[PDB]
PDB file of C-alpha atoms in Angstrom:
ATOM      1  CA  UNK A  73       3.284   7.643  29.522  1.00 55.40           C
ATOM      2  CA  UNK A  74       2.187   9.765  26.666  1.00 52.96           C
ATOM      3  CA  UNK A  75       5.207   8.322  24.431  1.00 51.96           C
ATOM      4  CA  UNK A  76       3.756   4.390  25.382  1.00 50.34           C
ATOM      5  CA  UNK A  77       0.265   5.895  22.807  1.00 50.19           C
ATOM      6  CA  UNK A  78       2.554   7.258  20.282  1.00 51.64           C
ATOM      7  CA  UNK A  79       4.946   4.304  20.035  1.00 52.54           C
ATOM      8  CA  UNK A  80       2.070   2.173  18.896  1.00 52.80           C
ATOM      9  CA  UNK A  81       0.699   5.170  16.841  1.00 53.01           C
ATOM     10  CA  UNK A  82       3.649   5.166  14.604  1.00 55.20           C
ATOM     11  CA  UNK A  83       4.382   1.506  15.018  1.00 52.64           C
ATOM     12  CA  UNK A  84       1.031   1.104  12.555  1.00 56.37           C
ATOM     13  CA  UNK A  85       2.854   2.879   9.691  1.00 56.94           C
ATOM     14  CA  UNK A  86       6.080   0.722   9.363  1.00 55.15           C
ATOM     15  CA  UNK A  87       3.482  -2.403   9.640  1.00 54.90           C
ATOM     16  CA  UNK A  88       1.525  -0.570   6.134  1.00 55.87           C
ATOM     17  CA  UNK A  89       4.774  -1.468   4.081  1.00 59.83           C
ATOM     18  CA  UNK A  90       3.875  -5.006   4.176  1.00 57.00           C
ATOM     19  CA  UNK A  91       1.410  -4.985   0.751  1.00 55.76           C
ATOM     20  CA  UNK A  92       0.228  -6.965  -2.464  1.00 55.75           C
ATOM     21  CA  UNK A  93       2.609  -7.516  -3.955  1.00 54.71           C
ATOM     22  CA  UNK A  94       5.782  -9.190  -2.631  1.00 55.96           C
ATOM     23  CA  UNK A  95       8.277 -11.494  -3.501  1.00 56.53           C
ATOM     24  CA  UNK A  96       8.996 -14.206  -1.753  1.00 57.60           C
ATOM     25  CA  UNK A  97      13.036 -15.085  -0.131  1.00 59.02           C
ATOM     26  CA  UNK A  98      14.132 -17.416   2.575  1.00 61.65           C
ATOM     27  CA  UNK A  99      16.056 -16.797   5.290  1.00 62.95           C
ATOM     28  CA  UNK A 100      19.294 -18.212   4.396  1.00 62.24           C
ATOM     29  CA  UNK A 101      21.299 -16.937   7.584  1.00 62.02           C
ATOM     30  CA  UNK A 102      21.468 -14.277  10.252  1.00 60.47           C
ATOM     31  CA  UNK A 103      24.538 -11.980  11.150  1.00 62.00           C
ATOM     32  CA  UNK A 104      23.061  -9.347  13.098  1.00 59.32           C
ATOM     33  CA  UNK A 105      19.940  -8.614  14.910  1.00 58.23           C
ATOM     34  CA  UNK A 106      18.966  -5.340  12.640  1.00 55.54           C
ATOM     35  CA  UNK A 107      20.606  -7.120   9.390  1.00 54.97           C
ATOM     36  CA  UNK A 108      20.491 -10.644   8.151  1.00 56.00           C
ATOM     37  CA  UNK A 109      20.973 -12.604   5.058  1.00 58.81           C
ATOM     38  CA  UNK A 110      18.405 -13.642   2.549  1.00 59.96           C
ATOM     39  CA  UNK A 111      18.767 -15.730  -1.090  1.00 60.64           C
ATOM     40  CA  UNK A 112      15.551 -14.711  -3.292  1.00 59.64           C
ATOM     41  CA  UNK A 113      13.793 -16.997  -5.624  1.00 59.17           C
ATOM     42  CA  UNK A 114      14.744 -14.619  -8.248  1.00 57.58           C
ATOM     43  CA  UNK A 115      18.742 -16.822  -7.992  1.00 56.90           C
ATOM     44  CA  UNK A 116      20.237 -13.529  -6.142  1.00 54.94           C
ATOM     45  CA  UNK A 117      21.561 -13.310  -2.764  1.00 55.60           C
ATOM     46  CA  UNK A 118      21.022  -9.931  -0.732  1.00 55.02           C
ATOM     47  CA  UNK A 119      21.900  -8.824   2.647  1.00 54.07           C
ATOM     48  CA  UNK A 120      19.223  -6.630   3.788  1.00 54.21           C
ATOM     49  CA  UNK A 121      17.727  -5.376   7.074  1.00 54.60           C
ATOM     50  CA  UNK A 122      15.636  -6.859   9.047  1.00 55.33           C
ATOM     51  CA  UNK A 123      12.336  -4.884  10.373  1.00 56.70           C
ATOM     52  CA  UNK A 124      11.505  -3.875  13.374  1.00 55.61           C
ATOM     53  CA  UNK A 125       9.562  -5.893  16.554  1.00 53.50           C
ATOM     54  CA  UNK A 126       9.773  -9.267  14.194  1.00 50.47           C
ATOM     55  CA  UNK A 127      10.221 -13.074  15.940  1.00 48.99           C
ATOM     56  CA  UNK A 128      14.315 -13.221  15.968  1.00 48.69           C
ATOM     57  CA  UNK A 129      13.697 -17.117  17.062  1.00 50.45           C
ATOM     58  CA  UNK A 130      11.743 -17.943  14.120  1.00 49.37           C
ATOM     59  CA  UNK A 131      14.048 -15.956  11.346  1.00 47.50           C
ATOM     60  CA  UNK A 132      16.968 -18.399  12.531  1.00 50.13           C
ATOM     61  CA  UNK A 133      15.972 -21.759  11.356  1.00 47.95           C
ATOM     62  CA  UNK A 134      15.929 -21.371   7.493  1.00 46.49           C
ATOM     63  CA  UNK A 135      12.102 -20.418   6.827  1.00 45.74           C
ATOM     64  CA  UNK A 136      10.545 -18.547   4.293  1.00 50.51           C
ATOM     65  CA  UNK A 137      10.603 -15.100   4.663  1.00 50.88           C
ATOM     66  CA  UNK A 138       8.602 -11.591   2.783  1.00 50.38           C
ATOM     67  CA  UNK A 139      10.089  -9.166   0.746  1.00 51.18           C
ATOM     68  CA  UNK A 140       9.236  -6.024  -0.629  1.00 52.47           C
ATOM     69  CA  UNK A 141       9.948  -6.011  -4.477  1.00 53.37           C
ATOM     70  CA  UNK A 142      11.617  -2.408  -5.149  1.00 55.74           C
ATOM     71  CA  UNK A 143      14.640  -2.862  -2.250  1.00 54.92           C
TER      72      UNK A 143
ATOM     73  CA  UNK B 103      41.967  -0.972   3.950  1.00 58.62           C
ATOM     74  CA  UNK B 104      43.157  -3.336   1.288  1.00 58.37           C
ATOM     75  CA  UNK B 105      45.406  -5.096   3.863  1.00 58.66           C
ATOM     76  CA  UNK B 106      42.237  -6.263   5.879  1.00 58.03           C
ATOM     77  CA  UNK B 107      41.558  -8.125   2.630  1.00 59.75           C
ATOM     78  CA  UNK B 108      42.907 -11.462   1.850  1.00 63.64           C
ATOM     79  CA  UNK B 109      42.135 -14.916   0.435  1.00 61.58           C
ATOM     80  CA  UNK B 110      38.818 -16.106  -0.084  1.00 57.74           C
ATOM     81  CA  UNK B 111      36.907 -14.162   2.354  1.00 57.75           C
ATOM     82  CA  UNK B 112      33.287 -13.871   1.383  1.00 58.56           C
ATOM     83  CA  UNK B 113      32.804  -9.640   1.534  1.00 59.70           C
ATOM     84  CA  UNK B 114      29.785  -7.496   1.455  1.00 58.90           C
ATOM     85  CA  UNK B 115      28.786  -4.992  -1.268  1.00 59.95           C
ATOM     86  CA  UNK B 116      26.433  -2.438  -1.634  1.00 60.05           C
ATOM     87  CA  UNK B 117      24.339  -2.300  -4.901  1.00 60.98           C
ATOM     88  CA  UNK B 118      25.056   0.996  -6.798  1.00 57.83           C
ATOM     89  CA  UNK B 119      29.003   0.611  -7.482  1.00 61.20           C
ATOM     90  CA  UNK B 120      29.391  -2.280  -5.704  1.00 63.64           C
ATOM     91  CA  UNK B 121      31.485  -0.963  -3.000  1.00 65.30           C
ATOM     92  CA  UNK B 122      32.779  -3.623  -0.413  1.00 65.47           C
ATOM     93  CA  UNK B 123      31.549  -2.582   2.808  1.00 62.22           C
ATOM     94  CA  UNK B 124      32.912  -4.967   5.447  1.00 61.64           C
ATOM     95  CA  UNK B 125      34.202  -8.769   5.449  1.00 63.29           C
ATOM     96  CA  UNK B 126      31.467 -11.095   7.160  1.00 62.95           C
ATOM     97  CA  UNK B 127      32.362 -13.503  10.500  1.00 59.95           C
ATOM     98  CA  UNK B 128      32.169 -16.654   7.783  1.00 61.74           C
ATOM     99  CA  UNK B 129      34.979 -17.889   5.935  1.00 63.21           C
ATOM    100  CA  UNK B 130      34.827 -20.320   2.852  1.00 61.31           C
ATOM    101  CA  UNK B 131      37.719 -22.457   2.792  1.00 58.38           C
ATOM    102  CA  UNK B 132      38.331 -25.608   0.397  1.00 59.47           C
ATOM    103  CA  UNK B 133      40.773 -27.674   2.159  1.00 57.18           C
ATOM    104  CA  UNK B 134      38.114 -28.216   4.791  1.00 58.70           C
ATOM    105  CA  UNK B 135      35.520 -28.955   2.828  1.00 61.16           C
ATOM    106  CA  UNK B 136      36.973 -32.344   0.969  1.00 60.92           C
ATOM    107  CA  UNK B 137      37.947 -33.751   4.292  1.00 61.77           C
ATOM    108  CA  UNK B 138      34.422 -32.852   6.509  1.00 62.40           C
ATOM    109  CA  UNK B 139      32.395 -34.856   3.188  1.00 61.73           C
ATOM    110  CA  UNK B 140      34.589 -37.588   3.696  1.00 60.71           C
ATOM    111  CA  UNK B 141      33.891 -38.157   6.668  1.00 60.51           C
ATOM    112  CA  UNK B 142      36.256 -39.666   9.127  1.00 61.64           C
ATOM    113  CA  UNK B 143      36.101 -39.799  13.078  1.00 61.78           C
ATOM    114  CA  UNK B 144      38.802 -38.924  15.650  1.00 61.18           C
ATOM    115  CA  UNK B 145      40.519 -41.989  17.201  1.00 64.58           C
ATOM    116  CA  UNK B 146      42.988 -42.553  20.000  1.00 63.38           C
ATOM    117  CA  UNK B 147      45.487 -45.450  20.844  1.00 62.02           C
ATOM    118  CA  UNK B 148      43.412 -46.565  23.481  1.00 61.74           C
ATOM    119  CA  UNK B 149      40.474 -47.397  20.558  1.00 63.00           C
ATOM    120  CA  UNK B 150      42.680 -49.326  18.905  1.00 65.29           C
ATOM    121  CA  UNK B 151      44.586 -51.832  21.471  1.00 65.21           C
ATOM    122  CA  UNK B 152      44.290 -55.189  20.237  1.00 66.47           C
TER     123      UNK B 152
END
């Protein structure tokens, strides 16, 4: 019951990574439900993974999606 | 192994020396490709009788 507090606890510091600035991709594809497939607006393709507790309905459907410049 | 690798199968990298990590569950094939933009549908005798 104690580890139900702390799950949210450190669920707030993966959430601070989100920040001014990012660069914007879009969801070309998926392939897994911890990786997927993005193409930035920089012209290169990346397969990265995806973060934690996010909508895997939404992703699906080619949308535009947040990066984080430096990775 | 080299022997899982063959022709035209797109293949993941990782950015530092590029290593190829695993091939990915979609292939890219050009023989299909020229015959799905045609675009033709499946038939049977039966369609055309006459």
């Amino acid at each position: 019951r104690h580890l139900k507090r702390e799950l949210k606890r450190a669920q707030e510091e993966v959430k601070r990574i989100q920040s001014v600035p990012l660069v914007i991709g879009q969801f070309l594809e998926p392939i897994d439900q911890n990786t997927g497939i993005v193409s930035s607006t920089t012209g290169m393709s990346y397969v990265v993974r995806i973060l934690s507790t996010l909508d895997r309905e939404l992703l699906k459907p080619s949308m535009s999606v947040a990066l984080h410049r430096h990775s | 192994n080299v022997k899982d690798l063959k022709a035209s199968q797109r293949v993941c990298l990782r950015s530092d020396s590029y290593m190829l990590h695993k091939v990915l569950e979609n292939k890219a094939d050009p023989l299909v490709s020229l015959m799905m933009v045609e675009k033709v549908p499946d038939s049977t005798y039966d369609m055309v009788g006459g």
